[PDB]
Amino acid sequence: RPDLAWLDEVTMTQLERNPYEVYERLRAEAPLAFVPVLGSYVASTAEVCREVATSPDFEAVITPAGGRTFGHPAIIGVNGDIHADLRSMVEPALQPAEVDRWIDDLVRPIARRYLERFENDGHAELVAQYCEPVSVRSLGDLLGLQEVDSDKLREWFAKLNRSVTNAAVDENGEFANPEGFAEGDQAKAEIRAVVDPLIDKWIEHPDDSAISHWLHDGMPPGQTRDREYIYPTIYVYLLGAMQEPGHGMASTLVGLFSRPEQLEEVVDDPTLIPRAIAEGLRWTSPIWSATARISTKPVTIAGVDLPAGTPVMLSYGSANHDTGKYEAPSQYDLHRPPLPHLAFGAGNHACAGIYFANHVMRIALEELFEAIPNLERDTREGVEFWGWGFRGPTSLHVTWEV
Numbered sequence: 449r450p451d452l453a454w455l456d457e458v459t460m461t462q463l464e465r466n467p468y469e470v471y472e473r474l475r476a477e478a479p480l481a482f483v484p485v486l487g488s489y490v491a492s493t494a495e496v497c498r499e500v501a502t503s504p505d506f507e508a509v510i511t512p513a514g515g516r517t518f519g520h521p522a523i524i525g526v527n528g529d530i531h532a533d534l535r536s537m538v539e540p541a542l543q544p545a546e547v548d549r550w551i552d553d554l555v556r557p558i559a560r561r562y563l564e565r566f567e568n569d570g571h572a573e574l575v576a577q578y579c580e581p582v583s584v585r586s587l588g589d590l591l592g593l594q595e596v597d598s599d600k601l602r603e604w605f606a607k608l609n610r611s612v613t614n615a616a617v618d619e620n621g622e623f624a625n626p627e628g629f630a631e632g633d634q635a636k637a638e639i640r641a642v643v644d645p646l647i648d649k650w651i652e653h654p655d656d657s658a659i660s661h662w663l664h665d666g667m668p669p670g671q672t673r674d675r676e677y678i679y680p681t682i683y684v685y686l687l688g689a690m691q692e693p694g695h696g697m698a699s700t701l702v703g704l705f706s707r708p709e710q711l712e713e714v715v716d717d718p719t720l721i722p723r724a725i726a727e728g729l730r731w732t733s734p735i736w737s738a739t740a741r742i743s744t745k746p747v748t749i750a751g752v753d754l755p756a757g758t759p760v761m762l763s764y765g766s767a768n769h770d771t772g773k774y775e776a777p778s779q780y781d782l783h784r785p786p787l788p789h790l791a792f793g794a795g796n797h798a799c800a801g802i803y804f805a806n807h808v809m810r811i812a813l814e815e816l817f818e819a820i821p822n823l824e825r826d827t828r829e830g831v832e833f834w835g836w837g838f839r840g841p842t843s844l845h846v847t848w849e850v
């Protein structure tokens with residue numbers, strides 16, 4: 449596309465460090481555009497992301513680096529009967545009435561445990577000491593991974609993140625950095641060594657862990673789903689499900705710190721925490737551009753005639769700064785009117801874990817603000833955000849008077 453020749457000079461490093469300047473141009477120039485270093489069409493606006501995500505002429509496809517990492521059948525990358533089965537497999541523990549039965553007793557004692565380690569220190573780096581551990585410890589216990597330390601769960605999602613988002617391609621469309629999948633393969637090998645004995649056990653002795661239910665639910669007597677059939681969805685969980693509530697919490701906190709009067713409002717009135725989190729997810733979407741769809745028929749989207757079989761990456765984090773919807777979207781504003789957003793995606797492949805995720809983030813922030821009501825950001829340290837596929841702050845140094 450001639451007038452987008454500037455896109456040939458966009459680099460993977462640029463998109464990882466800060467994709468918003470390129471995507472502001474895309475939303476104005478070409479809401480559906482082929483980005484050479486990603487080797488794919490990308491959807492950048494709210495209208496195009498929502499249309500592709502809900503279109504009957506599209507179905508799910510995994511991004512190239514996502515498929516190299518997760519294989520088949522990753523719940524995000526399949527359709528039809530396999531997708532319906534995998535959705536029926538994951539949905540029981542995520543049902544709102546079910547989450548409401550036990551989410552408080554799950555997350556609140558975990559939040560308190562991690563807080564007790566630093567709440568009298570006067571300083572902390574909340575990404576590593578709080579947001580990530582609460583997120584992974586909550587989900588890890590729900591899954592049946594109680595014995596996998598939070599440090600290890602955090603390491604695995606970081607390696608899987610880098611492998612799944614190792615998207616750069618060269619002039620021939622080949623991956624530019626094939627070595628960057630090695631740590632994804634190493635994480636998977638480690639996960640197998642830990643999880644294979646647990647699956648061996650659960651097949652014979654089912655329990656209330658979610659993965660035990662994935663093996664047994666809905667199956668004929670004495671049968672379980674084959675572990676190779678469920679492992680790619682285990683990996684989907686050990687990346688995003690483990691990573692994103694912590695990133696959403698942390699981005700919400702960075703946003704609140706950027707508006708001190710609003711941080712104060714929320715600490716004084718914790719019933720505003722859900723609204724603060726919803727704006728946090730719009731402001732820096734944790735899953736920023738990690739999923740995609742593929743056309744099943746020739747289709748015209750945003751004036752582009754796509755043949756059948758065309759992948760489109762859904763850059764929901766850009767869509768959530770669409771100035772057709774939002775005033776000054778790069779500013780965090782608690783008091784934005786509560787409008788639809790796309791941080792959980794849309795359509796038949798929209799996030800299955802919204803209700804659980806929102807509660808994890810809510811409870812963690814409630815406990816944080818109760819424990820440390822005079823929490824302040826350490827303005828001697830900068831907050832750097834990183835990531836194009838998954839995005840969040842790489843640290844969050846704070847201070848408080850002791």
Ligand code: HEM
Binds near residue numbers: 538796801
């Ligand atoms: C703040 C935290 C989270 C955010 C922002 C988030 C966001 C997303 C997004 C954008 C997608 C892709 C939707 C699309 O392609 O249209 C997705 C997929 C998915 N998410 Fe969430 N997620 C979060 C936490 C979780 C958690 C904790 C779980 C599990 C307990 C979960 C389970 C899933 C599943 C199973 C899918 C795949 C749905 C499918 O392809 O059918 N997510 N999520």
Ligand SMILES: COc1ccccc1O
Binds near residue numbers: 524683684685735739
């Ligand atoms: C819930 O986890 C994910 C969602 C979308 C893409 C990758 C994931 O691991």
